[PDB]
Structure 1
Amino acid sequence: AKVFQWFGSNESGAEFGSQNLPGVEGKDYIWPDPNTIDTLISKGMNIFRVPFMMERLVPNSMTGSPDPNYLADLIATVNAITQKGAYAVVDPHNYGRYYNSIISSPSDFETFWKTVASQFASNPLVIFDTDNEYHDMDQTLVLNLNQAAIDGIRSAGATSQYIFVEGNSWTGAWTWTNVNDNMKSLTDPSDKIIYEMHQYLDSDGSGTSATCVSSTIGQERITSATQWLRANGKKGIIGEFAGGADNVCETAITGMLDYMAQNTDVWTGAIWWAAGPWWGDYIFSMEPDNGIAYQQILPILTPYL
């Protein structure tokens, strides 16, 4: 059986070409392929994270009406995942920013989240992710935006679903404890907050190089966060991680996941970055049937499924 509550992949593409807003489906961005998601489910993956742009889903003002056509594809993608019994993570992949300006109004953000959650309120397999990778912004604001999201979600009657909260510092696991301590004060009447951290293995933790620092760097970089979660009685997820298809990265990945598997009292699982249809020869592609991580990394993930 499965080692973790959740183990799966990001399904990237709806957030592509972000300099073009709204942009054009099939030209600037694309939604995930349900057929290749099905393949990942057959391999044992049970969670799929779906990035999208806030501005494409709710144009101009985040308190306004959704765009019906982009919403239609978000719904279709999400419900196709959940119809197969997998969890679907709704990820406004926005960096704490809307038209590249910091989201400074928790109340506006709460209305955005009631709008979004109302589209999925009765689906217990949807997971709401408040925002991808807050960074370079006020730490109390980040707390308040996460809380506003939770409040908006629950106000819509979407009470069955987990909520993935994200911290500042690009929600990095390695930087969590001295940046994001205040995030322990988030509240949820459903008691379904998961602290989503991201952890890359290259020098600067940006996940842009296929080269990992060392064969133990993953374990090393999530150790402090693991202790923080335990000390605070919280649960976490690694919502993005990756490494190159090479020996040092594969060893680091195994080491990190084996470490997590020893600490399942706090770690709910892990989500690879990334599958999706427009990655080609991308160093981290988990897209069946020919992504490099699909072919060379999935065999080292299978032990957890």
Structure 2
Amino acid sequence: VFEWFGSNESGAEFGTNIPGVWGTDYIFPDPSAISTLIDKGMNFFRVQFMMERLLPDSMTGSYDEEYLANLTTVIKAVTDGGAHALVDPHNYGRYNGEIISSTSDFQTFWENLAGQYKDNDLVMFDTNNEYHDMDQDLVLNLNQAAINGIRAAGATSQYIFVEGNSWTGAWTWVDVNDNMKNLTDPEDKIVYEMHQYLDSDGSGTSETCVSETIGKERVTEATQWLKDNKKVGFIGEYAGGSNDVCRSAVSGMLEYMANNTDVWKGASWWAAGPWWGDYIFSLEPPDGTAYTGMLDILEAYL
């Protein structure tokens, strides 16, 4: 149906504390729980990490090789299972709490990182999670700095998932992120990643969806934008509560997208990972609320 259809794998970006310590501020996803979702048919995992944990000094400096080693382990569990792994610096366009205004530093950051992965054909690169509250020209230039660095590293087979401003939301895309059409890639493998949630404010913090059709309504304009500008997209985060109204909303949203696979390459549920507990949107097996409450809807596309 879609090129890629899967789930986020969260944990390594958890907590506020930098460094933080493994096991008390953050954890990495669990390869067994991933393997279990791969067995359900998923072929795409968006793997979260925090830049400040990978890069303890500056973003152009050297790595925490143990954090990096652990990230690469999770990526390899995915790619060895035959699935695509999207590497997501879950950073909101910010490094150490300040907006990334150095386009050159960000380019070097990505040149170094895609260097780690350049020979893995199953890796994809997400420039940054949910740019927001920042200059719209800077957003564009940071995404192009990422594409430039990634290609400079020799990573040429990999898709690059670019994000816009307004938390890369689908429902606001056409009002803020029109300049993002200007991005260019020598490999022609850019994919526009938007997020969309279904609660009253689109924050993805309530179990309750506005209506049975809210999901479709929130991705309509983005879909026309992609068509008009001859681009391809992906819903890198979505979710809904385990209840009849949201099930109807999620379903309708995915059905609409499935009718527009000319522009929609697929989606990834927010989220799986080992530290969600009783999270309203947990897709972690054996007992996450979405794992048992929503996964039957998703299996339509697997």
TM tier, shorter chain? over 0.9
Pairing 1:33-112 to 2, within 5 Å after superposition: 33-112=30-109
Deviations 1:125-144 (A, max 9, x none): 11100000000000000000
What is the rounded CA distance, in whole Å, between the counterparts of 2:125 and 2:163 in structure 1? 11
Divergent runs of 4+, >6 A: none
What is the rounded CA distance, in whole Å, between the counterparts of 1:175 and 1:164 in structure 2? 18
What is the rounded CA distance, in whole Å, between the counterparts of 1:277 and 1:174 in structure 2? 30
What is the rounded CA distance, in whole Å, between the counterparts of 1:148 and 1:66 in structure 2? 20
Structure 1 position 135 matched with structure 2 position 153: no
Judge which range, 182-191 or 56-65, deviates more.
56-65
1:150 is matched with which residue? Answer: 147
2:238 is matched with which residue? Answer: 241
Deviations 1:158-203 (A, max 9, x none): 0000000000000000000110000000000011000000000001
2:301 is matched with which residue? Answer: 304
1:5 is matched with which residue? Answer: 3
1:205 is matched with which residue? Answer: 202
| Per-residue deviation, 1:26 | 1.1
Instruction: Return the letter of the residue paired with 1:15.
Output: E
1:16 is matched with which residue? Answer: 14
Instruction: Return the letter of the residue paired with 2:136.
Output: Q
Structure 1 position 171 matched with structure 2 position 173: no
Deviations 1:52-106 (A, max 9, x none): 1001011221010111010000110001100011001110000000011000000
Aligned-partner SS, 2:48: strand
Instruction: Return the letter of the residue paired with 1:41.
Output: I
1:271 is matched with which residue? Answer: 268
2:157 is matched with which residue? Answer: 160
Deviations 1:265-291 (A, max 9, x none): 000000000000001111000001101
Deviations 1:22-54 (A, max 9, x none): 111111100000001001001111000111100
1:253 is matched with which residue? Answer: 250
Instruction: Return the letter of the residue paired with 1:85.
Output: G
Aligned-partner SS, 2:117: coil
What is the rounded CA distance, in whole Å, between the counterparts of 1:244 and 1:56 in structure 2? 31
1:185 is matched with which residue? Answer: 182
Deviations 1:239-271 (A, max 9, x none): 000000011100000000000000000000000
Instruction: Return the letter of the residue paired with 1:58.
Output: L
1:222 is matched with which residue? Answer: 219
What is the rounded CA distance, in whole Å, between the counterparts of 1:250 and 1:73 in structure 2? 35
- State the number of aligned residues: 302
Q: Which runs of 5+ in 2 are unaligned?
A: none
What is the rounded CA distance, in whole Å, between the counterparts of 2:141 and 2:281 in structure 1? 33
Aligned-partner SS, 1:48: strand
Instruction: Return the letter of the residue paired with 1:294.
Output: Y
What is the rounded CA distance, in whole Å, between the counterparts of 1:160 and 1:61 in structure 2? 28
| Per-residue deviation, 1:114 | 0.6
